[PDB]
Every structure is written in structure tokens, then in C-alpha cells.
Amino acid sequence: LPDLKIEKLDEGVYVHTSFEEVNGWGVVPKHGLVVLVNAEAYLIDTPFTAKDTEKLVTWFVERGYKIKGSISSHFHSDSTGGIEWLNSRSIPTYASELTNELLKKDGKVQATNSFSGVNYWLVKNKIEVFYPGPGHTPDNVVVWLPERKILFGGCFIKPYGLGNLGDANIEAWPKSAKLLKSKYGKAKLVVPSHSEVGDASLLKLTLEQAVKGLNE
Ligand SMILES: O=C(O)/C(=N\C(=O)[C@@H](CS)CCc1ccccc1)c1ccc(Cn2cnnn2)s1
Ligand SMILES: [Zn+2]
Ligand SMILES: [Zn+2]
């Protein structure tokens, strides 16, 4: 329904939000971020379509920022929908080796650059990628911004419900959420993909929801 919106969240950090009607769920927002590092912009999750990705990129370009790259938190289209367009514009794209393999298995275009491991610095000491383990999907990773203490949790952060479990790993999620909460209790802001920004308590709520889902 509403168009893509881009609003400031904190210094050098913007939240981009698109909306989608999802069968069985109603209107659902999709939040991603744009992080600025000295005159350059990094996309944390791409929008869902090539046209929303062009819009997002153009909004920062028109303000003098060069798009240095994008990182997708997991393989579903709401995080990677923009990789094809970014690659066509020769803008560096990034995703974990697991994410690219899922994209490949899925007949989707892959990120141009990959990484693996528990932690990976997209930008040394400024934009870190952390893999807590399987949860919402097998490959989901989060993005941490040290200065502002902002954690982009993506589709892993599910404080009020787990959402679509089609590619989830219900067995592993609680372990994954425990590790994530231990790691980022220091977060001032946690930005979920599908719900409002919150504080570190969202890590606890996600652990609870995951625990709850393993039972039933
Ligand atoms: O599981 C999910 O993360 C998500 N579903 C999807 O399949 C999503 C990819 S992860 C595709 C739909 C989509 C695409 C663009 C923008 C918003 C939603 C959600 C469905 C409904 C949600 C709301 N909420 C979560 N737990 N209870 N309800 S989140
Ligand atoms: Zn997903
Ligand atoms: Zn999602």
C-alpha cells in the first residue's frame, strides 16, 4: 500500500521500509537500513523489488552518497530482491556463503561477494555481520553497528510470533537466539525486519518465541 519510506533512525543511520500484503498475514512492513560511513552508503537488506531498490539508491545518490555496497541478511526476496539490480549497476553486493548457495539452489541471482564464519566485518570496526545459527532460515545473519550500538536483526527477530516457518529450523532457533542475546545484550536499538524497532528486550522476546515454537 504505502510507498517505500526512508527515515532517519540515528546519526548516519536510516531505516528504509516497504509494505506488502502477505496472504494469511495482512499488511506487513519490511525494514532494512542504510548506514553511512564518511560519504559512502551501505544497504543493510535490499528492498523487495528492483524499482524500490533503484528508488532507495537514487535517494542517497541525490544527496551526494556513493553506494559502496549492500549486504543481505538471508536468502528470501525481501532481503535479496535488489541484488539483481545492484549487480546490474556494478554496485558491490554481499551475502554469506550459505545465503548464496540457497539463492543458487533457488535459481536466483547471487551476491557478487560472499563470506562465512561467525563474524565478518563488512567495514572494519564499523559494520559487522554475525551468524547466530539457523532460525527463521538456515542462513540468517544479523548486522551490528558498534558506534551507535544498533543491531539489525532481520527476519530472525520475532518478538510477538515466529511468522512463516516454511524454511525455519525450529529445533535450532532457541540455541541461535540464546547465542544472539548473549552477544548483543549491549544493543541500544534492535531493528527487526517485520516489526517496530525496539531495545535489547527484543532479543529476549525472540528467545521466548523460539522456545515456545520448539515445544508445539
Ligand atoms: O516469516 C517471515 O519473516 C515473514 N514472511 C515472509 O515469508 C516474507 C519473507 S521472510 C515474505 C513477504 C514479505 C515481503 C516483503 C515485505 C514484507 C513481507 C512474515 C510473515 C508475517 C509476519 C508477521 N509476524 C511474525 N510472526 N507473527 N506475525 S513476518
Ligand atoms: Zn525470510
Ligand atoms: Zn522477511
mmCIF file of all heavy atoms in Angstrom, residues 74 76 78 136-137 155, ligand 2:
data_model
loop_
_atom_site.group_PDB
_atom_site.id
_atom_site.type_symbol
_atom_site.label_atom_id
_atom_site.label_comp_id
_atom_site.label_asym_id
_atom_site.label_seq_id
_atom_site.Cartn_x
_atom_site.Cartn_y
_atom_site.Cartn_z
ATOM 1 N N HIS A 74 19.557 -12.635 4.661
ATOM 2 C CA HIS A 74 19.181 -14.017 4.416
ATOM 3 C C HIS A 74 18.671 -14.111 2.985
ATOM 4 O O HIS A 74 18.504 -13.057 2.313
ATOM 5 C CB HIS A 74 18.158 -14.543 5.455
ATOM 6 C CG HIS A 74 16.782 -14.055 5.258
ATOM 7 N ND1 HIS A 74 16.489 -12.731 5.040
ATOM 8 C CD2 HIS A 74 15.597 -14.696 5.373
ATOM 9 C CE1 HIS A 74 15.180 -12.573 5.032
ATOM 10 N NE2 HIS A 74 14.619 -13.749 5.236
ATOM 11 N N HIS A 76 15.668 -15.021 1.463
ATOM 12 C CA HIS A 76 14.356 -14.676 0.928
ATOM 13 C C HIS A 76 14.411 -13.322 0.189
ATOM 14 O O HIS A 76 15.234 -12.450 0.507
ATOM 15 C CB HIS A 76 13.316 -14.658 2.033
ATOM 16 C CG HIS A 76 13.074 -16.017 2.630
ATOM 17 N ND1 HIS A 76 12.505 -16.203 3.870
ATOM 18 C CD2 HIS A 76 13.242 -17.255 2.113
ATOM 19 C CE1 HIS A 76 12.327 -17.495 4.094
ATOM 20 N NE2 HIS A 76 12.767 -18.158 3.045
ATOM 21 N N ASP A 78 12.678 -10.650 0.301
ATOM 22 C CA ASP A 78 12.597 -9.376 0.972
ATOM 23 C C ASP A 78 13.941 -8.839 1.456
ATOM 24 O O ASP A 78 14.008 -7.672 1.856
ATOM 25 C CB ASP A 78 11.595 -9.411 2.092
ATOM 26 C CG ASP A 78 11.961 -10.428 3.166
ATOM 27 O OD1 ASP A 78 12.706 -11.401 2.950
ATOM 28 O OD2 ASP A 78 11.444 -10.226 4.225
ATOM 29 N N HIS A 136 14.940 -18.529 11.686
ATOM 30 C CA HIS A 136 13.913 -18.193 10.684
ATOM 31 C C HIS A 136 14.254 -18.947 9.384
ATOM 32 O O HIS A 136 13.377 -19.532 8.722
ATOM 33 C CB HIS A 136 13.949 -16.688 10.459
ATOM 34 C CG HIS A 136 13.182 -16.259 9.269
ATOM 35 N ND1 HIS A 136 11.819 -16.417 9.186
ATOM 36 C CD2 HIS A 136 13.587 -15.764 8.079
ATOM 37 C CE1 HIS A 136 11.414 -16.042 7.988
ATOM 38 N NE2 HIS A 136 12.467 -15.642 7.302
ATOM 39 N N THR A 137 15.535 -18.897 8.999
ATOM 40 C CA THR A 137 16.038 -19.648 7.846
ATOM 41 C C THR A 137 17.368 -20.264 8.255
ATOM 42 O O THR A 137 17.884 -19.954 9.331
ATOM 43 C CB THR A 137 16.238 -18.765 6.584
ATOM 44 O OG1 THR A 137 17.062 -17.642 6.916
ATOM 45 C CG2 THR A 137 14.841 -18.318 6.006
ATOM 46 N N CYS A 155 14.945 -10.963 9.736
ATOM 47 C CA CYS A 155 13.752 -11.780 9.932
ATOM 48 C C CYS A 155 13.931 -12.810 11.042
ATOM 49 O O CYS A 155 13.039 -13.611 11.292
ATOM 50 C CB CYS A 155 13.374 -12.418 8.591
ATOM 51 S SG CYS A 155 13.366 -11.118 7.241
HETATM 52 ZN ZN ZN B 2 12.635 -14.673 5.376
#
